[PDB]
Amino acid sequence: VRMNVLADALKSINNAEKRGKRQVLIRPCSKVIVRFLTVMMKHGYIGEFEIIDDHRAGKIVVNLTGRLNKCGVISPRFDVQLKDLEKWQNNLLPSRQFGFIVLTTSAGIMDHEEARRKHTGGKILGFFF
Amino acid sequence: IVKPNGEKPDEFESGISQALLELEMNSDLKAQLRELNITAAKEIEVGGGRKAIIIFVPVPQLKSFQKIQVRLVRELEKKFSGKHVVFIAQRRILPKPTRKSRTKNKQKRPRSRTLTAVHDAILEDLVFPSEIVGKRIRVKLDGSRLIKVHLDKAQQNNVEHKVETFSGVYKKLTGKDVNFEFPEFQ
Amino acid sequence: MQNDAGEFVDLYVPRKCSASNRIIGAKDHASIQMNVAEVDKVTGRFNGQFKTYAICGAIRRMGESDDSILRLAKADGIVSKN
Amino acid sequence: RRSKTKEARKRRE
Amino acid sequence: PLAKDLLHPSPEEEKRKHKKKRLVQSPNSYFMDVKCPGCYKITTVFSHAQTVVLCVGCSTVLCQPTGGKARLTEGCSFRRKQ
Amino acid sequence: GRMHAPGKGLSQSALPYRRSVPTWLKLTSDDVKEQIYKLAKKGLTPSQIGVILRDSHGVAQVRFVTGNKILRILKSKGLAPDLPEDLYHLIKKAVAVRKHLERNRKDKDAKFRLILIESRIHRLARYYKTKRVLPPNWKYESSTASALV
RNA sequence: UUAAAGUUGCUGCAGUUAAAAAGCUCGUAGUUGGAUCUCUCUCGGCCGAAGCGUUUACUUUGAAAAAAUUAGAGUGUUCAAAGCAGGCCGCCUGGAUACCGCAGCUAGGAAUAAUGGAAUAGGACCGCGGUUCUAUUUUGUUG
Ligand SMILES: [Mg+2]
Ligand SMILES: [Mg+2]
Ligand SMILES: [Mg+2]
Ligand SMILES: [Mg+2]
Ligand SMILES: [Mg+2]
Ligand SMILES: [Mg+2]
Ligand SMILES: [Mg+2]
Ligand SMILES: [Mg+2]
Ligand SMILES: [Mg+2]
Ligand SMILES: [Mg+2]
Ligand SMILES: [Mg+2]
Ligand SMILES: [Mg+2]
């Protein structure tokens, strides 16, 4: 059945992107999906989005800028040490120059970059570029 | 006719309870108003200095206040002249249990008392003569939020002169930014 | 793009589609740079002014080059509301 | 116990 | 195609989407208010009604159930509610 | 999909957004509860009751009006099924399939559907055992099946 | 024997026709699992000892992790592989540092993921009553 809603969300937006669509309807939504999208949004890869609140689970409608090539998830969530991070990004990202690994950490959800700053490890969620 | 939990009355509470007394003597509602009480009251600034009255009632009496709410608002308004009077139930917010705690936690907190639930019962109450239709949380490119709230289109002419008063009210208790729209229809 | 010193090191700076924002390829010959003219609002004659669009070859096959041209025009007010 | 709480409920009610 | 307001659908269209796939899920049935002609009495009924319902005093049979909606007996007026 | 069938389909109810009891409804919480009580004393499951109210009495969801969900009302007032009414139904249906299955031995299909219905029984049961609605010695047994219903 | 081998594939391969998906369904263990919830009193000089908060996993931090080897400083073995030496006109110095899976300790963090807390209220929190028990002070000491 449906497990890992995050995965299904980002598949959907990545597809609506390759299709070159303007908006997306991604459902259901999560307090995780939301903070992920937000971290994505601060760097601009996406745009503003709006949460249709239904009495059950969310739907989220996302506005889109062509700036997103790939958006992905890594299942299972792996526990990523600080020391490991390098390896991870060097595997995942197109370049040292750009793109992000998003992890949840004790601090909050964030970018590999910002966590490097805060000196925290955590679990991997996904990545984008 | 006021019963604060902290047990100390105020100057707003004084005239407002007195207003209710006057509505017990001079109005058709006497029995109901005898039964009921209010816990608290406030005044605030919204929409270019326009003034709003906030009336906190004890929760189990709320659905009773809902009976007479419109009449009460007319009369209590003309007693207080131009102001906008809105009723909100007094709500317990039980702090989120953490790894660091004493035992203030013996039995678990019920969903009913909790941040999100309360903010939505507040929102529920504010608009009272209007139902709530649908609610849309929009996010700014900033990372800030705003909440569109949809109301019954039938009750429109009833509440549509208030509107931005709510927007101020909600902001002062809750702390979020809210707009109000009347949908065309379904 | 820019090195540390701030020079632009690049052969050329490619144009992105106006509709869908993809990069228009060095050799993509299905691409369009379309010129739409501006009238004088009093007369209805031609100014010498124009607003320009680009559309990559992807969107042309999908046929939705048309839709996008259109709502681009609306966003420029070259097409009336309704 | 059961009887005590039930009777406590009727006597509180 | 490539431009749609998912946020503001046309009400026409939303009457046409399936009851779970609307932007927010809306029941397709409504409570109706039935009056058999020879009686004064008002009854509240469900639009899609299983069982069979009755006006008490006249033993008037209000409706037969069917697959989708209950079909009321002839001459019997009804008013959808709000 | 369906758990035991190939078929995958959409048939359900969608509850309206508004949880507020509408205006027209003239019944109290308590009126409805008395209604419920006598309707259970005519020996009906939760399902029955709910639909009955929905049809004649204009109660969309008993839940909204009286604040509690149906089965809790009945179990608080003490009139409740011993075993949860669905598990009841499953067992009755399983019984029936056996009763026809003794006389027609040559039927393979019925024999197979029996196994399905049984497996469903056990999943359900073990659910009611982890959730303590059943004494955890409780066991579906083919022979005493006829009794429980 | 290692790479080449993305020809053992966790990263990372395949399974319509090239090698390959079970005749079909039920099914226990196994793996996997939807939304949802923003710390406090007894002692000591307002702060330490005393508590606990449901418990874990995850994470960061501390201390412990034999030397040799490996990574890595210093040093013209005449160079280097080495060695741990040397260097100044009796003095001046070296002989560092990192890494050390997992397990086990330590102190922060509370996002994620488990898990618990009240449903015939044998629930919390209040203070009032009885019944039984027994420790010890006190009636200048002993009973
Ligand atoms: Mg199955
Ligand atoms: Mg090899
Ligand atoms: Mg290799
Ligand atoms: Mg191969
Ligand atoms: Mg062949
Ligand atoms: Mg073959
Ligand atoms: Mg096959
Ligand atoms: Mg199993
Ligand atoms: Mg989950
Ligand atoms: Mg060593
Ligand atoms: Mg070495
Ligand atoms: Mg360790």
From Swiss-Prot, chain A:
Pfam families assigned to the protein according to its UniProt record, in alphabetical order: Ribosomal_S8 (PF00410)
Protein name: Small ribosomal subunit protein uS8
HAMAP family assigned to the protein according to its UniProt record, in alphabetical order: Ribosomal_uS8_A
Quaternary context: Component of the 40S ribosomal subunit. Part of the small subunit (SSU) processome, composed of more than 70 proteins and the RNA chaperone small nucleolar RNA (snoRNA) U3.
Medical condition linked: Diamond-Blackfan anemia 20: A form of Diamond-Blackfan anemia, a congenital non-regenerative hypoplastic anemia that usually presents early in infancy. Diamond-Blackfan anemia is characterized by a moderate to severe macrocytic anemia, erythroblastopenia, and an increased risk of malignancy. 30 to 40% of Diamond-Blackfan anemia patients present with short stature and congenital anomalies, the most frequent being craniofacial (Pierre-Robin syndrome and cleft palate), thumb and urogenital anomalies. DBA20 inheritance is autosomal dominant.
Modified residues (N6-succinyllysine): K87
Gene3D superfamilies per the UniProt record, alphabetical: 3.30.1370.30, 3.30.1490.10
Protein family (similarity comment): Belongs to the universal ribosomal protein uS8 family.
InterPro entries documented for this protein: Ribosomal_uS8, Ribosomal_uS8_CS, Ribosomal_uS8_sf
Domain of life: Eukaryota
Keywords: Cytoplasm, Diamond-Blackfan anemia, Nucleus, Ribonucleoprotein, Ribosomal protein
A GO biological process held by the record: positive regulation of cell cycle
Chief location bin: cytoplasm
SUPFAM superfamilies membership: Ribosomal protein S8 (SSF56047)
Molecular-function GO term, any one: structural constituent of ribosome
Compartment(s): Cytoplasm; Nucleus, Nucleolus
GO CC term, one of those recorded: nucleolus
Curated annotation (Swiss-Prot), chain C:
Transmembrane parts of this sequence: none
Alphabetical keyword list: Acetylation, Cytoplasm, Endoplasmic reticulum, Isopeptide bond, Ribonucleoprotein, Ribosomal protein, Ubl conjugation
List of residues that carry N6-acetyllysine: K81
UniProt-listed InterPro entries: Ribosomal_eS21, Ribosomal_eS21_CS, Ribosomal_eS21_sf
Entry's Gene Ontology cellular component terms: cytoplasm; cytosol; cytosolic ribosome; cytosolic small ribosomal subunit; endoplasmic reticulum; nucleoplasm; rough endoplasmic reticulum; small ribosomal subunit
Sites bearing N-acetylmethionine, chain numbering: M1
Family: Belongs to the eukaryotic ribosomal protein eS21 family.
Oligomer status and interactors: Component of the 40S small ribosomal subunit.
UniProt-recorded name of the protein: Small ribosomal subunit protein eS21
Phylogenetic placement of the source organism: Eukaryota, Metazoa, Chordata, Craniata, Vertebrata
From Swiss-Prot, chain E:
Binding locations of Zn(2+): C36, C39, C55, C58
Tissue specificity annotation: Expressed in a wide variety of actively proliferating cells and tumor tissues.
Family: Belongs to the eukaryotic ribosomal protein eS27 family.
Name of the protein: Small ribosomal subunit protein eS27
Biological process, per Gene Ontology: cytoplasmic translation; ribosomal small subunit assembly; ribosomal small subunit biogenesis; rRNA processing; translation
Organism ancestry: Eukaryota, Metazoa, Chordata, Craniata, Vertebrata
Stored Gene3D superfamilies: Zn-binding ribosomal proteins (2.20.25.100)
One cellular-component annotation, GO: cytosolic ribosome
Listed cofactors: Zn(2+)
Biological source species: Homo sapiens
InterPro entries given in the database record: Ribosomal_eS27, Ribosomal_eS27_Zn-bd_dom_sf, Ribosomal_zn-bd
Feature: compositional bias, Basic and acidic residues: 1-15
Pathological condition linked to this protein in its record: Diamond-Blackfan anemia 17: A form of Diamond-Blackfan anemia, a congenital non-regenerative hypoplastic anemia that usually presents early in infancy. Diamond-Blackfan anemia is characterized by a moderate to severe macrocytic anemia, erythroblastopenia, and an increased risk of malignancy. 30 to 40% of Diamond-Blackfan anemia patients present with short stature and congenital anomalies, the most frequent being craniofacial (Pierre-Robin syndrome and cleft palate), thumb and urogenital anomalies.
Zinc finger (C4-type): 36-58
Molecular-function annotations in GO: DNA binding; RNA binding; structural constituent of ribosome; zinc ion binding
Region of interest called Disordered, as start-end residue ranges on this chain: 1-22
Major site of localization recorded for this protein: cytoplasm
Name of the coding gene: RPS27
Subcellular location: Cytoplasm; Nucleus, Nucleolus
Binding note for cofactor: Binds 1 zinc ion per subunit.
Modified-residue entries (Phosphoserine), positions: S10
Swiss-Prot record, chain F:
Residue positions where N6-succinyllysine is found in the record: K26, K33
Entry keyword set: Acetylation, Cytoplasm, Isopeptide bond, Nucleus, Phosphoprotein, Ribonucleoprotein, Ribosomal protein, Ubl conjugation
Gene symbol of the encoding locus: RPS13
Positions of crosslink type Glycyl lysine isopeptide (Lys-Gly) (interchain with G-Cter in ubiquitin): K26
Location of Phosphoserine modifications: S29
GO cellular component term of the entry, any: cytoplasm
Modified residues (N6-acetyllysine): K26
Keyword Phosphoprotein: yes
Modifications after synthesis and translation: Ubiquitinated at Lys-26 by RNF14 and RNF25 in response to ribosome collisions (ribosome stalling).
Biological processes, Gene Ontology terms: cytoplasmic translation; negative regulation of RNA splicing; ribosomal small subunit biogenesis; translation
Family label: Belongs to the universal ribosomal protein uS15 family.
Complex formation: Component of the small ribosomal subunit. Part of the small subunit (SSU) processome, composed of more than 70 proteins and the RNA chaperone small nucleolar RNA (snoRNA) U3.
A GO term, aspect molecular function: mRNA 5'-UTR binding
Cited function: Component of the small ribosomal subunit. The ribosome is a large ribonucleoprotein complex responsible for the synthesis of proteins in the cell. Part of the small subunit (SSU) processome, first precursor of the small eukaryotic ribosomal subunit. During the assembly of the SSU processome in the nucleolus, many ribosome biogenesis factors, an RNA chaperone and ribosomal proteins associate with the nascent pre-rRNA and work in concert to generate RNA folding, modifications, rearrangements and cleavage as well as targeted degradation of pre-ribosomal RNA by the RNA exosome.
Modified positions (Phosphotyrosine) in chain numbering: Y37
UniProt-annotated location(s): Cytoplasm; Nucleus, Nucleolus
Top-rank taxon: Eukaryota
Covalent link location (Glycyl lysine isopeptide (Lys-Gly) (interchain with G-Cter in SUMO2)): K42
Keyword hit for Cytoplasm: yes
NCBIfam families: PRK08561.1
